[PDB]
Amino acid sequence: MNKWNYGVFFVNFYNKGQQEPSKTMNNALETLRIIDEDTSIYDVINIDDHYLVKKDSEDKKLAPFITLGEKLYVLATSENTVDIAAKYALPLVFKWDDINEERLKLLSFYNASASKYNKNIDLVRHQLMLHVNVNEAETVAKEELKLYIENYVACTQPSNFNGSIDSIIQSNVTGSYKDCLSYVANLAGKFDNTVDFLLCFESMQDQNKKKSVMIDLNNQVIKFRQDNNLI
Amino acid sequence: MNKWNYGVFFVNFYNKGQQEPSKTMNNALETLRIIDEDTSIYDVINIDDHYLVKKDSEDKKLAPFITLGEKLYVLATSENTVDIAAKYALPLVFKWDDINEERLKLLSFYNASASKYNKNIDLVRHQLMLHVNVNEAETVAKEELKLYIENYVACTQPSNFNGSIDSIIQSNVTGSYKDCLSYVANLAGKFDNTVDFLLCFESMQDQNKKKSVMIDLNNQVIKFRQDNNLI
Numbered sequence: 171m172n173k174w175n176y177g178v179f180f181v182n183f184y185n186k187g188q189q190e191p192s193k194t195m196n197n198a199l200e201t202l203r204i205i206d207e208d209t210s211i212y213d214v215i216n217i218d219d220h221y222l223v224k225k226d227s228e229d230k231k232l233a234p235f236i237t238l239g240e241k242l243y244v245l246a247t248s249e250n251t252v253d254i255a256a257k258y259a260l261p262l263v264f265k266w267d268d269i270n271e272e273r274l275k276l277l278s279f280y281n282a283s284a285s286k287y288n289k290n291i292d293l294v295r296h297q298l299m300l301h302v303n304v305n306e307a308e309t310v311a312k313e314e315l316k317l318y319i320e321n322y323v324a325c326t327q328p329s330n331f332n333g334s335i336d337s338i339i340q341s342n343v344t345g346s347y348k349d350c351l352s353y354v355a356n357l358a359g360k361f362d363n364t365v366d367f368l369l370c371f372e373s374m375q376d377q378n379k380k381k382s383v384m385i386d387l388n389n390q391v392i393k394f395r396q397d398n399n400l401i
Numbered sequence: 402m403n404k405w406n407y408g409v410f411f412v413n414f415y416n417k418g419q420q421e422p423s424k425t426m427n428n429a430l431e432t433l434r435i436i437d438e439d440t441s442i443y444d445v446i447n448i449d450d451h452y453l454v455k456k457d458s459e460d461k462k463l464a465p466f467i468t469l470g471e472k473l474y475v476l477a478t479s480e481n482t483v484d485i486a487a488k489y490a491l492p493l494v495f496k497w498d499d500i501n502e503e504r505l506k507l508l509s510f511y512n513a514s515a516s517k518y519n520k521n522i523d524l525v526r527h528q529l530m531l532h533v534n535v536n537e538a539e540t541v542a543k544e545e546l547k548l549y550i551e552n553y554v555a556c557t558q559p560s561n562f563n564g565s566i567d568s569i570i571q572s573n574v575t576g577s578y579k580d581c582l583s584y585v586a587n588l589a590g591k592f593d594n595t596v597d598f599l600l601c602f603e604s605m606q607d608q609n610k611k612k613s614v615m616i617d618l619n620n621q622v623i624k625f626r627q628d629n630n631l632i
């Protein structure tokens with residue numbers, strides 16, 4: 171409730187970045203391995219696949235409901251699909267490809283709508299979806315995440331790709347460790363400190379890096395909690 | 402006696418019919434509180450929404466995963482898929498709508514594939530999805546459950562509502578508590594007692610039976626456990 175739960179997510183696509191169709195998955199099976207045996211704190215896994223047109227037999231967009239464990243959430247996909255969520259008090263799951271700016275404009279309607287329906291959402295915690303990529307070398311990390319995406323937008327019809335693939339990244343989480351930690355736990359802030367994270371560590375090719383950037387942070391939260399009043 | 406597990410699923414479609422627009426969603430939310438608020442045996446939830454053509458520009462059908470907490474699953478969408486799932490020796494989620502005859506011919510296919518990749522399968526809990534209807538007057542349910550499906554049916558293209566949707570209902574759980582129970586138990590045996598349940602109590606409108614069937618199960622199972630010791 172000040173205590174930040176952590177989850178993991180994966181996109182669902184064919185041959186992300188460069189990785190050969192079989193490889194993308196073995197990596198993702200490893201990402202899950204850690205979860206089970208080499209960590210704790212990663213307590214839920216998600217599967218971003220939202221780039222899809224979800225409409226019934228009447229060209230009617232379905233209600234993006236995200237399920238995490240017993241809990242149920244709804245993707246803050248728009249101003250209408252977000253307003254509505256206020257109505258029933260449901261928490262939102264912030265998109266990954268949302269320039270932090272614009273995605274901030276949406277927890278805004280969600281404070282404004284909550285108001286409207288005179289709803290009391292002080293205990294509703296949003297979920298933030300970030301694409302981590304940690305490499306002591308500033309720049310390798312960014313040119314690596316610009317491959318997980320550049321593929322991803324082959325599918326989605328992107329106008330951005332005229333002037334924006336850098337911002338998404340700039341919005342996402344990358345660089346050395348400390349600047350990664352100090353960036354998110356900075357961003358939490360711009361979200362009135364009301365979010366939990368679903369962070370994709372799949373741009374990261376060097377498995378050993380990834381396994382190390384995972385159990386590090388585990389051993390970090392597991393402590394931060396322990397250390398001072400959590401569980 | 403290995404400790405069997407239970408989740409809860411929800412179907413996802415609009416203007417159900419019989420249940421007006423925000424009728425369903427308002428019941429849905431009531432299921433949800435049952436879980437959070439008065440139960441302890443419902444570990445996860447799910448929002449089935451199968452009837453889609455998870456295609457893309459390239460027309461490649463997307464890997465139909467399903468996630469239940471920190472664990473990954475592969476929906477028995479077909480015979481290949483199951484086979485593919487056989488490799489990674491990932492569990493399967495048998496779906497509420499395939500006729501028990503196909504939620505079996507399919508399980509059969511898995512095990513063929515699996516012990517044909519050397520992937521040990523012993524300890525692999527699969528997951529059964531069934532709609533439920535409970536009320537002493539074991540004839541009611543079938544009507545209010547026949548309804549739901551009859552209210553959904555249209556899209557999917559079921560090899561039967563041009564005959565009747567009596568197989569599907571036959572496959573799911575209609576009748577009366579005391580009975581129903583004994584019957585799914587009877588269904589677990591058809592899969593070497595290594596299948597877990599995902600129960601969607603959303604056929605039954607009277608929300609009092611709902612909260613009762615539910616809390617009825619709960620206690621009854623957490624009692625069982627506290628007994629033969631497993632919690």
Ligand SMILES: CCCCCCCCCCC[C@H](CC(=O)O)c1c(C)c(C)cc2c1nc1c(=O)[nH]c(=O)nc-1n2C[C@H](O)[C@H](O)[C@H](O)COP(=O)(O)O
Binds near residue numbers: 174352383
């Ligand atoms: C490595 C690749 C990318 C990783 C990205 C995600 C990593 C997880 C983030 C770790 C959190 C970290 C703690 C850790 O290092 O152990 C961490 C860091 C590094 C920093 C700089 C600040 C953190 C913080 N963690 C928390 C936290 O867990 N809970 C919290 O309430 N505040 C935290 N804060 C500050 C909050 O803003 C503030 O303390 C809180 O709102 C108190 O409220 P008020 O001011 O209103 O009284």
Ligand SMILES: CCCCCCCCCCC[C@H](CC(=O)O)c1c(C)c(C)cc2c1nc1c(=O)[nH]c(=O)nc-1n2C[C@H](O)[C@H](O)[C@H](O)COP(=O)(O)O
Binds near residue numbers: 249254411413448
């Ligand atoms: C936990 C499981 C939940 C239960 C599942 C059974 C079905 C529940 C249905 C809940 C309906 C509810 C409607 C309510 O009561 O008013 C409801 C909810 C709770 C939410 C979050 C969204 C709804 C929605 N209902 C509708 C709807 O009825 N019709 C519609 O066209 N869009 C609806 N949407 C929104 C779509 O996002 C939108 O159509 C699409 O994004 C197009 O807009 P744009 O692109 O511009 O964003």
Ligand SMILES: CCCCCCCCCCC[C@H](CC(=O)O)c1c(C)c(C)cc2c1nc1c(=O)[nH]c(=O)nc-1n2C[C@H](O)[C@H](O)[C@H](O)COP(=O)(O)O
Binds near residue numbers: 405
């Ligand atoms: C009311 C709405 C509909 C509800 C439908 C979903 C829930 C249905 C109830 C099923 C759970 C129930 C739990 C309970 O007892 O409280 C339940 C029922 C009703 C019945 C009839 C049998 C149960 C059973 N539950 C378990 C169980 O949790 N674990 C177990 O190992 N065996 C259980 N069994 C027996 C196994 O089949 C048995 O272990 C095996 O056949 C023998 O193994 P071996 O070959 O090694 O010797």
Ligand SMILES: CCCCCCCCCCC[C@H](CC(=O)O)c1c(C)c(C)cc2c1nc1c(=O)[nH]c(=O)nc-1n2C[C@H](O)[C@H](O)[C@H](O)COP(=O)(O)O
Binds near residue numbers: 181184192465481
């Ligand atoms: C947990 C994170 C997600 C993983 C990352 C996303 C990338 C792919 C992950 C799994 C890889 C794998 C490929 C492999 O190992 O060779 C893989 C898996 C595990 C699964 C379950 C399905 C795959 C699949 N790979 C491919 C593929 O490369 N190409 C393709 O055309 N279809 C692929 N499919 C689709 C099926 O083969 C089939 O076309 C369809 O599902 C049949 O459904 P229906 O007939 O019922 O509609």
